[PDB]
């Protein structure tokens, strides 16, 4: 199929700062990826983003009834929906399962990678640190970064490049909003 495609998108965005203390509503219209007109509650009128949107900003800005609907949205729409969802979104807290397993950077002979697998958590902000004998190890650390699972959970792997020696204690430490103190998992050769 090579028939040309045409895409319209609309994003009605509600931005919250300190709960509902400060709220910004952004009504955004797109043709393919090009935002062409928007309503910003900071302005209170539509503005053309590109020349493609100038006819809509002129026309819609001429209709005071339309504008007052948009001007009310921070209250009637944003703050209302925030109230509806806040308890299972803003306040959602799922703590991570933490697994530590050894691996190899390339097929070698000896495991030379310690993987700290941090799975199933929400929200996304997390701090994962590696320790050797209680001193933090900051060199040779690499990660997948933060991975969305698409189901309201995240995961991340944080790997330490090291040749483990007997007598060494390795600790992966996880800090996350769902936790009241750091989660630590130990590993020994």
């Amino acid at each position: 199929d090579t028939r040309p495609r045409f895409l319209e998108q609309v994003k009605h965005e509600c931005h919250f700062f300190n709960g509902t203390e400060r709220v910004r509503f952004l009504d955004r219209y797109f043709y393919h990826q090009e935002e062409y007109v928007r309503f910003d509650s900071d302005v209170g009128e539509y503005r053309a983003v590109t020349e493609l949107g100038r006819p809509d900003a002129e026309y819609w800005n001429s209709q005071k009834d339309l504008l007052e609907q948009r001007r009310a949205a921070v209250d009637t729409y944003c703050r209302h929906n925030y109230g509806v969802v806040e308890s299972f979104t803003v306040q959602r807290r799922v703590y991570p399962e933490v697994t530590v397993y050894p691996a190899k950077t390339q097929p070698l002979q000896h495991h030379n990678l310690l993987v700290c697998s941090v799975n199933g958590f929400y929200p996304g902000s997390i701090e994962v640190r590696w320790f050797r004998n209680g001193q933090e190890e900051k060199t040779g650390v690499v990660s997948t970064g933060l991975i969305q699972n698409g189901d309201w959970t995240f995961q991340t792997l944080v790997m330490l490049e090291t040749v483990p020696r007997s007598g060494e204690v390795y600790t992966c430490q996880v800090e996350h909003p769902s936790l009241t103190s750091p989660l630590t998992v130990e590993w020994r050769a």
Binding site: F6, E13, V84, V85, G150
Partner: protein
Amino acid sequence: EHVIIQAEFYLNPDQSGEFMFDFDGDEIFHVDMAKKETVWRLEEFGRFASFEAQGALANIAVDKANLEIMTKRSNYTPITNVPPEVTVLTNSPVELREPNVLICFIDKFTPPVVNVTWLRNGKPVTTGVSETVFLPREDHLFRKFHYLPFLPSTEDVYDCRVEHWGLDEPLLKHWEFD
């Protein structure tokens, strides 16, 4: 800071529309346009809230009407295909014979039309598969997830096969037990 977005789209000539709500990058729900039903991304959401799915159809009708106007206004300038990036991962560390889930993450593409097949040992598998709708990105491309629960073995290999009009050939992303 949190962000709630009501994201809509309408695509010609496919005449496909979508209506969903997003919280901080995760889908709260979308409207099944054919059934006119609200589909909560987690079941527990539907016990805490409701949404009159019928009203999503009004938005899509306006968006279809706006698309015809903008298409004409643009002198019929069509979309440029952006092919996806594809990643295959599991949602937990893999243990032999311990049930797990393969995730196929399809990212950074447009238009929002894709064919995705899970292959086990080169053969399509459909038992137990699920998927998300097209999810919006802040750069106004799309992303999507497909899922395959599975029993990890040494004798099975897997691929996520993605077809998209911006790809020259299907993109196959492999997974096997290390």
